[PDB]
Structure formats: C-alpha cells, structure tokens
C-alpha cells in the first residue's frame, strides 16, 4: 500500500476539509508503523492495536485532518465538544484507529501558517463523516444575512493560528483516522 503516501505525505487537509481515501488490495506491515514511534498518538478503538495485523480487509477508510494538541481529546470515539458537535463528528461506534503527530515544523509557517480552517457554526452536528463542501453563511443570530458576512449571520471558524513559536496546546497536529 502507500501508507508512506499518507504518513510521509507532504500536505494535510484542514479539519473543515478532511481527506478520505479508500484502501484495498495492497501489502501493508502494521507493527512497523504503530511501533515506529514517530507519532504522538496512535490509539485504536475496537481493534486491538497490539499486533492484530492478522487481517486483510475488504475496505479501509482514511480520514486526514489538522487540530491542536489541546484539542486532541475532542477528536475521539464518543467524544463531546465544539469540533465534534460543530466541525467534524465521529460516531461512538468507531471501529478504527487514530494516529496523530505534532507537525509544527511542517505545518507552521513564518508569520503564522493560516492554512487550516475549522467549522465554527452549524445548526446541527455532523451525521457520521462529511466534509467542508458547502461553506455558506448562516444566520446565527436574529435576522437574515442577505449578503456580506455580518451582524448575526456568519461563516465557520477562522484559521488556526499555528505560529511555529506556539505552545504545544496551541501547536499544529496532523491526524489520520483508519477504519
């Protein structure tokens, strides 16, 4: 397979526009990667992470996105909070794995790297795995927007302010979720 195209990959998608890839019919070695000790988080819910590589599956879904360290606890099976309710929601029955590593040196940028966007407003929560397609403006306050983002009517969240000199709670992390 091309896990290196996922792990040794160049660009990562922002959480509002996470990246899904289907994977099947290829050769993968799992304990080399989970034990590569290159990631800050590699937590598997459902399947045992410990060498439960005795399988070959019909399909593999890979969802990639960007968060901050402080925010990792909200990116988890059956987790509650801003991102899940308003930005990207995962169902409680997540039979998969989540990997994430600090990519400050790779996702920061001088003057700040403002490439990652997040959805900050939504009327509802995300019905298992959708992405930033429609990015309109919604009245999130009293009356019609009719145009220019303004009073009681906005977009989603801004950029992440991933300056390279940030604290870790404020640092960029790349996340890849395998189902």
């Amino acid at each position: 397979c091309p896990f290196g195209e996922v792990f040794n990959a160049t660009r990562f998608a922002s959480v509002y526009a996470w990246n899904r890839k289907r994977i099947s019919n290829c050769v993968a070695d799992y304990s080399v990667l989970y034990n590569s000790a290159s990631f800050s988080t590699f937590k598997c819910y459902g399947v045992s992470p410990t060498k439960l590589n005795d399988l070959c599956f019909t399909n593999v879904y890979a969802d990639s996105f960007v968060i901050r360290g402080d925010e990792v606890r909200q990116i988890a099976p059956g987790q509650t909070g801003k991102i899940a309710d308003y930005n990207y929601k995962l169902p409680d029955d997540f039979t998969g794995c989540v990997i994430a590593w600090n990519s400050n040196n790779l996702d920061s940028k001088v003057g700040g790297n403002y490439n990652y966007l997040y959805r900050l407003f939504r009327k509802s929560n995300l019905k298992p795995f959708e992405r930033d397609i429609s990015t309109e403006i919604y009245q999130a306050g009293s009356t019609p927007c009719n145009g220019v983002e303004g009073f009681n009517c906005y977009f989603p969240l801004q950029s992440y302010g991933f300056q390279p000199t940030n604290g870790v709670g404020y640092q960029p992390y790349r996340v890849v979720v395998l189902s």
Partner: antibody
Amino acid sequence: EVQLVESGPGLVKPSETLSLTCTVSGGSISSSSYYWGWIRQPPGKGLEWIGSIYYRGSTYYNPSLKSRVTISVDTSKNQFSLKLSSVTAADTAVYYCARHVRSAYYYGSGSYRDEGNWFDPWGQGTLVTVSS
Amino acid sequence: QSVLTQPPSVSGAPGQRVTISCTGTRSNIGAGHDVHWYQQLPGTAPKLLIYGNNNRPSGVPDRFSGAKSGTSASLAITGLQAEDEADYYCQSYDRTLTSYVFGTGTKVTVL
C-alpha cells in the same frame, strides 16, 4: 497589551467636522469582527455611545446622531478616526475610543446576542471643548 | 429612557455591604441584551467589572455580585474594602434606541 491613543485639537468651532485619531497596537482593525468605537462623556455625566466600525467597512452610529457622526479606519496604521459634523457647544465632552476584539464574548450563547455587552481596551481619553 | 437609572449615590463605612440599583426599560434591562457592570476610578479609564449579567473579569472580588429582574438590576458589594473607593456604572443594550445605555453611576467612600 492593547493600546489606544486619542489625538486632536482642544478647540473645534461649532458647525464643522472634527477629526480625532486613535492609534492602537496589539491588534489589527482588520481582524475578523473587530470594532473601533467612540463614546462621549459630558462633564460629570454619563457615558454616551457614539459609534463603531468594522474591518468589513460596516459601521454603526447613534441613530439620532448618525447624520452628524462619522467614523473612519486606517488598517495600514492601525488607527481609528472620529469625525464630528455640525458640532455645537453642546457636543463639548470627553471622547473615548475603544477596541472590540472580534465579535462578542464568543463563549456564552456562541455570541448569539448581537454584541454580548461591550468592548475591552479603553483609551486614556481626550477632552474636547466646543465653543466659538 | 436614554440612561440607565441608578440612585445617585450609595455609601458605607469600610467593611459594610453596599448595593447599587439600576433601573432600565423593557428594551434594555427587560427584554434587552444582558447587563454589564463597570468599576472605574474617577477620571480614569473604566474597567469592565461584570460581564454578561453575572460574569466577572479576573480581578473582581467575588463579593461583587449582580442580579437582574424585569427592567431593574442591582450590584451588591458585600464587605466594602479600601479598593472599593471608586465610581460604579451599570450598562445594557437598549433595542428601542439600538444603543448601549449606561447607568448614572455611584461614588463610594469608605467611612
């Protein structure tokens, strides 16, 4: 960490337009939802809201005073200017400019209350006297 | 009407509880947009003291509390301390004037 500074002439003739400056630092008036406002305070009296701008060029003036109030911004210098037309000795007062960080208190209703309650950083203030 | 209405002064001796009332209308204190309180040393820049009816910015003693009901609100400072010698104003947005309207304000002296 936010700084505002009002500058201007102490004596502005009645029935004219006064332009006062308010250089700031620590934030950009280009920041999403940020505001810059003007408020007046007559001798020993209460505060009076005058106006606010927006990095989107949206702006608000006291409805009763809209036609006589004018606010302008200069993102490049991070400054807010307050212009007052048809001034009168009645308009004599202490002028304050103030910074509004993004929208309202975003936490709590999701800022779903127009503007929470108010702003954050106040300037030192400038005393303006109107007389002919 | 255009001013929130407060009793023009409220006083007490050091250690007393001093409360300040604040009378508004349907459009501000009543059906309006929540009440904030400011603490401000006379002639000096005010400082937000209470936000969103009942939030405190960090630094305001827990002994300052706010309450609202109908078109009237009050702030209670329960155990006046030397730091409490200031002016105090209430404020709230009025939908009828579409303006943020201040209270008439109170100066404290620790007797």
